[PDB]
Design a protein around this ligand. Structure first.
Ligand SMILES: CO[C@H]1O[C@H](CO)[C@@H](O)[C@H](O)[C@@H]1O[C@H]1O[C@H](CO)[C@@H](O)[C@H](O)[C@@H]1O[C@H]1O[C@H](CO)[C@@H](O)[C@H](O[C@H]2O[C@H](CO)[C@@H](O)[C@H](O)[C@@H]2O)[C@@H]1O
Length: 346
């Protein structure tokens, strides 16, 4: 009851910087988003990423850390071990820069020391399309496929494709149908491709089938934000997946709040209630009978979905939220509890 689960995927963000490593507190400093339904000439400003004012409603136990600090990465991997989460699902933005390449290598190396695996979460990078996706899948498999920490399920890499609906099924078919013009099927670069189920079944069922995804996930930590992130739909989504040979990987999270960076987005807040929100969502995933679960998130601090330890903090600029009345590592240990319950059902 302590071993890592390799059907549990925790969404991980590698975009943080520190003075120690990067020379800048990247992402801890963040622009504030204008209200999309507000007026013109909004000047919302920026969170400066100082000790006192960071781009989160919570405050990390590890402080304003760098994602490129090997000592932080060690600690993160120990946290994954505590949580029993065997797969780190790494955000990937196609930055095409030496710092990205360095960081990915460091993350893989750190993960392997703890027998954690790494897969990629392919984000909506500029001009993303099925041809450059193929090229990037080839690149990532070529670069990292022989690293011992690179994840495979029954011999195949796995990719989560965020906002897959931004690409038409007629394009996806070219990449993902066995007869597709630029198919990866039956090639050295074949992979499990997990698309994002957002809206109602009348839209999503034909999308997933016609695009030839291997499965689907839901991402959002906030219950009811989409049809897919409404857990009362999960039993029927799983039934459909099973009938159609698809892998359903529902996403569970401990809460949501992003109002430091999106002050206008308060309707999406989901309160943690000392763990009860996380418990309800994880229980529903398990009860749906799925074979894999994803966790939003390890460390999306901007969106308040993180399970990474947070500490009480009041500064002159902001009174942060915290996990009280639970301890800083509560969400790691509660994840381990749920991983056990999930395994009991597998
Ligand atoms: C209305 O758009 C949201 O909801 C749609 C579904 O109805 C999604 O398809 C769409 O992508 C939008 O969801 C993202 O944005 C909202 C805010 O509008 C967040 O609440 C969501 O959680 C989601 O964004 C997060 O997850 C994405 C996957 O990892 C990631 O791409 C996002 O990154 C963006 O926001 C962060 C700030 O939190 C910013 O630093 C990044 O540069 C990027 O702009 C985010 O993690």
């Amino acid at each position: 009851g302590t071993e890592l689960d390799y059907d549990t995927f925790c969404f991980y963000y590698d975009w943080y910087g520190s003075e120690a490593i990067d020379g800048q507190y990247r992402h801890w400093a963040h622009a504030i988003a204008p209200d999309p339904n507000g007026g013109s000439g909004q000047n919302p400003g920026t969170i400066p990423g100082t000790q006192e004012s960071i781009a989160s409603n919570f405050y990390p136990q590890l402080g304003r850390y760098s994602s490129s600090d090997p000592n932080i990465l060690t600690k993160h991997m120990d946290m994954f071990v505590m949580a029993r989460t065997g797969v780190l699902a790494l955000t990937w933005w196609n930055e095409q820069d030496e710092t990205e390449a360095k960081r990915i290598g460091l993350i893989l190396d750190a993960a392997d020391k703890k027998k954690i695996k790494v897969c990629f979460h392919l984000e909506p990078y500029p001009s993303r399309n099925v041809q450059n996706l193929r090229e990037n899948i080839v690149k990532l498999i070529t670069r990292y496929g022989n690293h011992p920490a690179f994840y495979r399920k029954d011999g195949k890499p796995l990719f989560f494709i965020y906002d897959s609906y931004l690409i038409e099924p007629s394009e996806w078919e070219k990449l993902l149908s066995p007869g597709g013009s630029i198919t990866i099927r039956n090639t050295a670069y074949d992979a499990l491709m997990i698309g994002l189920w957002t809206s109602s079944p009348t839209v999503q069922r034909p999308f997933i089938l016609n695009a030839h995804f291997d499965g689907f996930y839901t991402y959002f930590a906030a219950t009811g934000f989409t049809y897919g992130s409404t857990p009362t739909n999960w039993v029927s989504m799983q039934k459909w997946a099973k009938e159609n040979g698809k892998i359903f990987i529902p996403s569970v999270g401990p809460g949501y709040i992003d109002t430091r960076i999106r002050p206008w987005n308060g309707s999406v807040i989901r309160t943690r209630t000392d763990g009860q929100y996380y418990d309800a969502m994880y229980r529903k995933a398990i009860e749906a009978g799925v074979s894999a679960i994803s966790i939003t998130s390890f460390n999306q601090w901007h969106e308040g979905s993180q399970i990474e330890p947070a500490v009480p903090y009041t500064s002159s600029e902001f009174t942060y939220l915290d996990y009280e009345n639970r301890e800083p590592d509560y969400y790691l240990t509660r994840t381990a509890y749920w991983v056990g319950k999930f395994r009991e059902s597998k």
